[PDB]
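Dear all,

This email documents one entry for the complex benchmark we are building for the journal club exercise. For each entry we list the sequence lines for every component of the assembly. Then comes the predicted three-dimensional structure of the complex as a token string, followed by one or two observations. Please use this as the template for your own entries, and keep the labels exactly as they appear.
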Amino acid sequence: EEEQIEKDLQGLQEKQRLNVKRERRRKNEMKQKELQRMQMNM
RNA sequence: AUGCCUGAAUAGGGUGAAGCCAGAGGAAACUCUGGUGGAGGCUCGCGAAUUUGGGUAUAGUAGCAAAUAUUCAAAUGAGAACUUUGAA
């Protein structure tokens, strides 16, 4: 009964941590990509 | 040997390069995983070679001339294996 609460709490916390790391990486990558595109047309 | 002008042709199978997308590891650089993409001195059926047209430069013996399967009936004709029609 409580095992389900513990399991989905831990799973969704892990999902949020992975999402935070992935979003940081994606934001850095997209920022660098658009800066390179801006400086590439010359 | 090296060319020039105007045309035809430069096919197919396999593999899967940069670049890109979504993920995981790392502070970056980067490295793996899946996809996408469709590139090449990649493969498959000092030397040699490097498709093609037109134009234009520097004893009646050997044997039967070799491309397989012919058959039946009728017509023509002096004469039909070889011509013609039908059937196989």
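Observations: The radius of gyration of chain A is 18 Å. Residues 18, 22 of chain A lie near RNA strand B (CB under 10 Å from a C1').
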